[PDB]
Amino acid sequence: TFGYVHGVSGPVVTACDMAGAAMYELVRVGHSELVGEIIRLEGDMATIQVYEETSGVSVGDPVLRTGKPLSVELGPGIMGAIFDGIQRPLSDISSQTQSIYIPRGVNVSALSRDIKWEFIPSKNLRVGSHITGGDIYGIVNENSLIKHKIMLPPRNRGSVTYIAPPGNYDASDVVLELEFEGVKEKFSMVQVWPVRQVRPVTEKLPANHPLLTGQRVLDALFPCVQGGTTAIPGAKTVISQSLSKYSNSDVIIYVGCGERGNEMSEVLRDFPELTMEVDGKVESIMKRTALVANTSNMPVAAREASIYTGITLSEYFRDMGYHVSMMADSTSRWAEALREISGRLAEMPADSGYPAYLGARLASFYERAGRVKCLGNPEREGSVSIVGAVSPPGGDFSDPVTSATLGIVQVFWGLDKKLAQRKHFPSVNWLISYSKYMRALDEYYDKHFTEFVPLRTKAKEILQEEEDLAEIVQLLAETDKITLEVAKLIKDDFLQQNGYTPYDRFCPFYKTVGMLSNMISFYDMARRAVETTAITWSIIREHMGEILYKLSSMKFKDPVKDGEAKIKADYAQLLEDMQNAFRSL
Amino acid sequence: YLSQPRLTYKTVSGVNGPLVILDHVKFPRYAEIVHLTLPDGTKRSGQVLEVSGSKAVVQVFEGTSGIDAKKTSCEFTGDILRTPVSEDMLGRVFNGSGKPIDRGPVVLAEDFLDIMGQPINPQCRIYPEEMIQTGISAIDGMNSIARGQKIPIFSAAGLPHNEIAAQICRQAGLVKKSYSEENFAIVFAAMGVNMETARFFKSDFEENGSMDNVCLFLNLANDPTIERIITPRLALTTAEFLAYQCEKHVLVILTDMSSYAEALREVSAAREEVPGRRGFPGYMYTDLATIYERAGRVEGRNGSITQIPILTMPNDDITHPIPDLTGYITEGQIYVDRQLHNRQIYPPINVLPSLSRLMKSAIGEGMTRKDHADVSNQLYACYAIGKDVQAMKAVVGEEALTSDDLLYLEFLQKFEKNFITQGPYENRTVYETLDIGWQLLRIFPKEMLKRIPQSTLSEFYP
Amino acid sequence: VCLFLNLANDPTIERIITPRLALTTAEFLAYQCEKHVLVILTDMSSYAEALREVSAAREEVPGRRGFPGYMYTDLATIYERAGRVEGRNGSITQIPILTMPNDDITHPIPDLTGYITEGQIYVDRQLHNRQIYPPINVLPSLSRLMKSAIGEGMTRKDHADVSNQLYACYAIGKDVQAMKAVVGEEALTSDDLLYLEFLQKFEKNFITQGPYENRTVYETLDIGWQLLRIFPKEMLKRIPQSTLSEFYP
């Protein structure tokens, strides 16, 4: 029924005579019919958070109650698409309006309603069958790589009554009917799922298959699993398309909840041009991905909704059977949005002014990822990975956001105290950086590489060692010197990836292995004692200056141009050079 | 008992966040539980938080989504939360709200207990005498735990405190002096934990066969917060019953109490109270008192309880209210050192800063062995001095070193290599720990062991 | 030039509306007249103060330092109105000036501005006390030249390498300068003295530029190379082999 608006206070709207509405039922407001979601009920009064600037709204304008809460459309065509936080097909709207301005277009179906699709029903279905539903009954053929499928919406189970034949359909044509109860039901190729719910599953399975990235820090000292939970202090984001290119993933989801406008146009521009080419046939990454779009100016409600619709699509493609890698640009923006809404509602804030239930909401954000046995007749598996981001504020190590994230995620990377080298993104703080997948990857690595375990422990030891000494050194022993310059060499060349350059676009495993192995061997061949084994550091420097320059220039071995065999042969030759140089001493 | 029919309300004054306001309520009780029927038929539950006049207030565990103003309904059981209890809950795993997560059924109620409980009579208190073997060399040797001593385990994020807890669960037991282990059980309760490292608790507990004598509780991080508030009290009630009504010693372990503090802050925010220091509620101290000190020995009985919570340090803030208060209410403490974890020592337990208050009486001639106190003192001094000698050699250089300091360095390095290292699946009785300690002590001559009386050296050093 | 004026004597509330007028006019000239414009805002702190007045008058929920919550949204509105668009000429380049209460980088206003704009150029009183006409501390500065100054088609190929090497050497120079105050000059190695000299000559030549001096990009690159020449080639840890052999000799 229609009520009348009663008040406007920024993006809030107090309306009257809306008794009977749930506090997450949607509503249309004003003659322009802006989208809204309820927050607080009181008597017949109600409170409405809108998704659009409220300028020009008059008191008393009609409000139309809609029967459903916030929801997300699903179906074919999702891949290779861009939406906003409320699932807005911006490409369609830009085509339709022929203008760079976004009107108040609140009537645009998220999925195209005209493109036909090649339906190929499963062979095992039978007319009148009492399978009592399930999940799979079809495959859509309209994609070169991502073989989309049609599944059955959950909580709806029953016997076959009619099945469409193979052929073209506009995705609104009913292709399946399950009465089963004396009441007939029809299904299209598109379903609707509430955004804030959790899709159920059969059983939560572990994660042992490893996830390998293009960063030396993570691959080296902070292993991550396929489908695990990680946090990345993104202050880089190229890792997303690096995984799309190299990692064993299928569907890539990125959500720019609060991205700066220029950099968002940047991603939108450069991203579609990348090419993938597994089987020697070039294919754009745009087919194996899907994007969500939100600049910083958009209303707060959209920024809230984007982070959830991202996970809903991730869980849809989890049920789809594939493996998914998702990452969020910045959770801190979502936290700030939650602060803004909470302060707007005039409630009592907690420490630092953040609302108390920040932690609970962040927990809800997680706990929706991992390997899983899905609900369905063809028993199969799927995975979702989540890579959140942390933006260290002025209080790098005391804000509640980093605290709450630190208490949940499994693998965490942080930066140290802010160095003068502001461009030093690959920093690592040992105080709060950790990973809990060390045990699970032992059984994988014992049959691929076993040498890196002592090397990694030595790297951690030496890093700790100068971490301990640099304090006194600011305010000596030969071993102190050897260790200090070794650690500086590691920090400067093994770490300190530019990221953007032909020499750090991606670093496969073997390059890291060679780099660290040679570095640690160089350390070991001098640390043993004054002599070569059980002179001074300066004579070592003057002899091996050229060798040290080679150690530093190891990083300039491009994998895209130089073959792996050439580069490893070069590493071995330089190892022999070190051996000859040390033996002549 | 309640001989009257229950009430059913249809009045819903309004909704505000995780609360629900009702009107026309007849004689509402403060902490009574209620159920809610939704339009789609889904069932829910909540607790009464604030009552005034005919108005009432109810917080909903499952979250207030979809509740309407006419279609929803309410129900009043007319009684505060009560829980069942019985011996047979051993071998069972619950989710904290009483529902068994295991495939098994609902436990039968041998009795019903008030969840809040009531305090101890100070006169009836009894000083602990015996001790509990822990299966960790450091915990048994450097320190000790009486039957009634409450010690926390400070740690930090990224450290393997869950794993120390799991090992303690697998290895817990009483020392056989020469009335069985049937008089020993454990109640492990984990709060606000990740899905991972929780199924790990389940699987590690199930494989070894510990289910015979463990009652387990799991509360997930994504669960309702009020469940987190309730759960540790529930587990303490169960331990209380099993240890006092039935003659049995018990060892309760609690994990990640910082999450409990967070939930306490949540409920405080719900009730509109002004935060005190650092945002934590001002009445945190009283609450933490109520949770603790439900353990010890009492007159006329034989059962006992021993309490071992786990705390997480917010970035090594030793003056943070949580660790500080827990220290003010507990006896002694144990640290976990990050540098040892970097050094790849499976038990990262540190030695120098730790301390047990009641060690002097937890051991003795009537216990495992007479020597132990002297051994502990001597090796404590040796370890401290050896750390100082490593600091010397850092600057002076080995060339200016004496033989005694070389032996001290040997003691330090072998201690680190052998004694402190334990292994995830290795067991050591207290006698073996004493023997290994004597092996370490043997490196020095008899005279260099100043701290130990000549008698003990005469018996044992040869 | 189209210009606006809000002076100190004027009523405070006008500052809320003042900048948006200028931005609307600039938007019109850029997206409609296809003119490349440059909008210079100044003293955004006064805008923040006016917003504080408005919020405090309404008894709205306050936040950090009494600032209202929603100026993050408000500053987002006032800031991103820039960048080119498809099918059109002209552009909007926006250089606002923010005064900095005391010396607080963690103050709310500059911090929030940091989260929105894609860069920042820092001014330090130290250089001003050392009589440097452009007192610009390059260490905290940062911009998204990240793929704009490539060199392929743009000015020159070495741009990023020289910039990075100067940056790192400057950082180490500041480090050794700090170490100098701890221990006397005698304890420094030859490389430490080289770093100190490089630092000194760097602010004396590169940073210190006179007013009205219109240096070209090639000129500054050459000056940078001349500064590089102070060290031998083996300390060029960041420059690739090709450029190093191309220009260093």
Partner: peptide, 13 residues
């Protein structure tokens, strides 16, 4: 703390 207490007290009206 003072500011929050002030707004809380004002909330009564």
């Amino acid at each position: 703390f003072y500011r929050l207490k002030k707004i809380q007290e004002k909330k009564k009206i």
